[PDB]
Amino acid sequence: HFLEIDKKNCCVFRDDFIVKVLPPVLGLEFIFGLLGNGLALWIFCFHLKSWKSSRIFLFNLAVADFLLIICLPFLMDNYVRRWDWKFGDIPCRLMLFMLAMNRQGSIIFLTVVAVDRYFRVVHPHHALNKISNRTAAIISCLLWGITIGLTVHLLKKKMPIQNGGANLCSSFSICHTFQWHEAMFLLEFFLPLGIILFCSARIIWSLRQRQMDRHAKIKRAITFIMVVAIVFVICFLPSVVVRIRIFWLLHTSGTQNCEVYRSVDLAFFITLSFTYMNSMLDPVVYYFSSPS
Amino acid sequence: QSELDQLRQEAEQLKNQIRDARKACADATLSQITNNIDPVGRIQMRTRRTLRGHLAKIYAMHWGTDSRLLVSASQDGKLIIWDSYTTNKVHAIPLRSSWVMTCAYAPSGNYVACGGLDNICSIYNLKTREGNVRVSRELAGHTGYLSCCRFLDDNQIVTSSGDTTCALWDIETGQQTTTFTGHTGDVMSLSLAPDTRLFVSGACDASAKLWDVREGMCRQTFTGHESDINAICFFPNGNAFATGSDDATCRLFDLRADQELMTYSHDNIICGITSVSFSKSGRLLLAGYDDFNCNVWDALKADRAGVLAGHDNRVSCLGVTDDGMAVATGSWDSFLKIWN
Amino acid sequence: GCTLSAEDKAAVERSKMIDRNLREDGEKAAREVKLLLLGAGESGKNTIVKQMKITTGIVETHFTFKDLHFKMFDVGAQRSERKKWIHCFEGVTAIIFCVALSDYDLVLAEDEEMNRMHASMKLFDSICNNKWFTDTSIILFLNKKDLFEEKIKKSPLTICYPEYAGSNTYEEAAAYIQCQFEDLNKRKDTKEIYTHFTCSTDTKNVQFVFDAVTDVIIKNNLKDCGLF
Amino acid sequence: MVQLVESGGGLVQPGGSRKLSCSASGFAFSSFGMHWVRQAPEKGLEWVAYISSGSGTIYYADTVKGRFTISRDDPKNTLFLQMTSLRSEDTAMYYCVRSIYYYGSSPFDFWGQGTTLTVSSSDIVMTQATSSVPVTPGESVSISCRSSKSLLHSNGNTYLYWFLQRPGQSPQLLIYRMSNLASGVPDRFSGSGSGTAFTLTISRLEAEDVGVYYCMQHLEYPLTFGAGTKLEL
Amino acid sequence: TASIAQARKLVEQLKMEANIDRIKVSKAAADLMAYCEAHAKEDPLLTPVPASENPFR
Ligand SMILES: CC(C)(Cc1nc(-c2ccc(O)cn2)no1)C(=O)NC1=C(C(=O)O)CCCC1
């Protein structure tokens, strides 16, 4: 009861609180985020014809977010019915690959934008500040390749996994193995957050100890940097803390019972919905709030 | 100060009788005579070539007499000679001073001259036994910036300067041969008559003068503009020329009637004119503007006949080949376009 | 492609080599900081240009500081109208303006009525509110400070400013001069004025110019990532 | 003035290597492409190898490809030809030729005074009908050359070159692209032709310009010369 | 009195440029009309030449 079998002992669940709550919030997220990312892509590709390295990085982040958003109705259908993957076999692992790759790419490009800004403020006279579009594209392609190579292992998953008569594509199940994807899920929050905090703190300190912030328009940039560093935290903290709670429960108690695992699974699959808030919110934060 | 007043009054009465004679010779107008000529149709010419490689504002260009090669100058301290058919770069010449604002190409094809804010006209030899292009002469007589220069042959060149004077040089010796001093404002442009016996200059005092190369005297002075004259060009026939000033108008003057013929302006046009050129038969009158555009004018009835709109910044220079096949435009956005 | 002859292919290769040389020169010229030195003849530009750097036409001065290269153009020998060639200098990193503090009582030789400091203020007003220099910062130097301190003992500042109501102390009169020059700026929202008093200071001028240039370059780097 | 000097040569036995170098002085070496051309004893010219400006393009003839290698030292103004596994038919006098390519340029304009290497013990074919023509000073002579494939191109250029080699001197360019007279050549030589047949005209023949005349094509690599016609007094 | 020579020069110049004989505007207008009409065929920018004759095709 409330136990499933995967490659090892692996406690999967099905609940109705998720179908009660998640589908509407995902629908609203999809609407606003798709609209914002599409408008940003349109403006970038046609409205402004003057590109630079920073705009290249912003455009890469925008396309990663757009690719992430285009697969939300699949989750909507997977959730309206409790847990029943009635879309096939290839769509399952393809959609999982898209989700993982797009999330990792969005995080990586946020970190790259933060590092670019830190180099622009703290080290004004640096060769890195004046680079051609070609090398920016090459670095972007290298980062895309790294993300793709990290994510490819999800394209070999052994088809949709069936729990009793039901079907589900979830790979975030309380599951007594020592898989590396949980480690990557934690690391892709922990390390980029440290990099972003370092860069933001140094930027604020340097721009403030040069008596530069007296300027009436520097303050807006200061506020924008603080807003970005706060949005990242409030988008990606609850998932990590819930997963660490799950890890402690699995380490201490064991998989013989699953009721506490049931409650924490509800919590985790609700807090995962906040991740798409970053994708629907960063258009206005990054591309629209920038003056020209 | 009494005799000076007598001289001023005599000059004033001389100007009055000059204007009286001009009025006596002004019975008809070109617009009245050309009222029954069929207009040329709407002109649709499109970009055939884009020349890229300059990294700063283009200030001047000039066609070769073969109608294939052209030279252009830029503020990035480079002088580039292009093959317009292929867009291949033939030469790249680095300048000692990067503050260039004029360039010229010798009719023989052997030399290229450029100058600018260093008050020096430099001549470059393109055809040497060695592989490179070297400076063959520097002319250092002017006390203001060089604004225009035009070759007469391989040994003579005429220059205009911001010290209100034009001069004629001997390349081999390097000395001024003649000086033209009539103007009382910065001379901004000049144009040579097709047979290289006369030339006209336009100055920041809103007047244009016709000079004789041999004697070195101003035969005729033309007025009518309300602002600085930036560009000037002869009609191909040789008996007329057109000027483009900062008051957003072009005007056409004839030498024999010694007065203005017709004005080219529009209500929607507000910006200054940077450059002016004629077509091979003189029917079209192209003009560059500050509003990023270029207008084609019917020179016989003063109605617009087309627009060349492809530049993101000010149109700084334009020229028409000797065979009349193409028009080149340069801009402050660092690109050259060949229209046809 | 393959429709080209051998000589055409060689000409294309020549053009490619010229293109790479042009790109290399452009990148070499993109590193340097270029300044436009201005000011009247008696302002004191000579000591200024000979203390950062240690017949007619534009004069170019090249110096270095902390592995950053500088180029300073002096256009004092161009007696032509400014409007026909000043747009050549749009895109300079900053403008250095020199003023002599000790000429608050001297008058120009050309005209008796036109006071010399008022001529400097008129030139500053013309340069500051020019459509080519909307977002260009100005490094303003006040030079003859020691002569100012010596001469305000017996020459009241009312000789130049009839509404002055201060004292003969150097610091307050210097503040009044600084306020008079810094208030001719009308943009006040897109460019800044960096005033500095130097008479015989050594290596302070170069440091002040370096700091102002670093500030300008930071605010320009904020204009490529959209954060500004 | 412009000077090209080659060093090396001498006696080599079969199967042994040798290296040739050419030193340039008096011109902008790095802007020029360079060729090697060899002339066998009592034979005509034969193209060997080419290296472009910047060393971006290299071509060899089939008779030497895989055995020879060509390189240039731009800082030192030196061209090299490293020869490996020489053969009895490699005995010739090797020349170094400079050529620059852009619109309106004249390639093959300077031939260095060559060096001699003696070894101990499809392609366009160019034909010149006659081989020996008696001549008298003051008269007119008409050297003729013919090509198997048309040298006219879509752009309108005919790629035919005329060279003269006086007794004991290096070859000298006379006409480039079938109609354009060379720089220092007197206004007594004329070039004419159309497509596949070509002619060279001399008026008021004098004593100094008797020798061997070669036609060359520059339409496709490899470059091929004709068999020269000898004007004899 | 430095400009007295200059003022006399200007007066002499104005005497010089007045002696030129002028021609009625109608005749010059007719001359420009005739030149424009005579060379109408020899003007590629006015009337497009066929694409087989255009070097910038
Ligand atoms: C496939 C995936 C992303 C799990 C996974 N991530 C990695 C990985 C990442 C980085 C790296 O460097 C290596 N591996 N491998 O697998 C997943 O659980 N998706 C689902 C949802 C969501 O994502 O919102 C909604 C609820 C149902 C499940």
Author numbering:
A (entry chain R): 9 to 300
B (entry chain B): 1 to 340
C (entry chain A): 2 to 55, 181 to 354
D (entry chain E): 1 to 121, 136 to 247
E (entry chain C): 6 to 62
Quote the original article:
Hydroxy-carboxylic acid receptors HCA1, HCA2, and HCA3 can be activated by important intermediates of energy metabolism. Hydroxy-carboxylic acids possess both hydroxyl and carboxyl functional groups, playing a pivotal role as intermediates in energy metabolism across various biological processes, such as lipolysis, tumor proliferation, and inflammation. These compounds have been identified as the physiological ligands for a family of G-protein-coupled receptors designated as HCA receptors, which consist of three members: HCA1, HCA2, and HCA3.1,2,4,5 Upon activation, these receptors engage with Gi protein, leading to a reduction in cyclic AMP (cAMP) and adenylate cyclase activity. Herein, we unveil the cryo-electron microscopy structures of the 3,5-DHBA-HCA1-Gi signaling complex, the acifran- and MK6892-bound HCA2-Gi signaling complexes, and the acifran-HCA3-Gi signaling complex. Additionally, HCAs’ ligands, characterized by a hydroxyl group, engage with the conserved R3.36, Y7.43, and the backbone of S45.52 across all HCAs.
Additionally, to deepen our comprehension of the molecular mechanisms by which agonists modulate and activate the respective HCAs, we have determined the structures of MK6892-bound HCA2, acifran-bound HCA2, and acifran-bound HCA3, each in complex with the heterotrimeric Gi protein at resolutions of 2.80, 2.73, and 3.01 Å, respectively. As severe flushing would be caused in clinical trials by the β-arrestin signaling pathway of HCA2, synthetic agonists, such as MK6892, acipimox, and N2L, have been developed and MK6892 is also identified as a selective agonist of HCA2,25−27 while acifran demonstrates comparable affinity toward both HCA2 and HCA3. The acifran-HCA2-Gi and MK6892-HCA2-Gi complexes demonstrated conformations akin to the 3,5-DHBA-HCA1-Gi complex, with root-mean-square deviation (rmsd) values of 0.8 and 0.8 Å, respectively. To stabilize the HCA1/HCA2-Gi complex, the single-chain antibody scFv16 was additionally incorporated into the HCA1 and HCA2 complex. The agonist 3-hydroxy-octanoic acid (3-HO) specifically activates HCA3, whereas HCA2 is selectively activated by MK6892. Consequently, we opted to swap the amino acid segments 1–129 between HCA2 and HCA3, creating chimeras HCA2(1–129)/HCA3(130-) and HCA3(1–129)/HCA2(130-). Neither chimera was activated by the selective agonist MK6892. Activation was achieved only with the introduction of double mutations Y862.63N and S91ECL1W in the chimera HCA3(1–129)/HCA2(130-), highlighting the crucial role of positions N862.63 and W91ECL1 in HCA2 for selective ligand binding. In HCA2, the essential residues N862.63 and W91ECL1 are critical for selective ligand recognition.
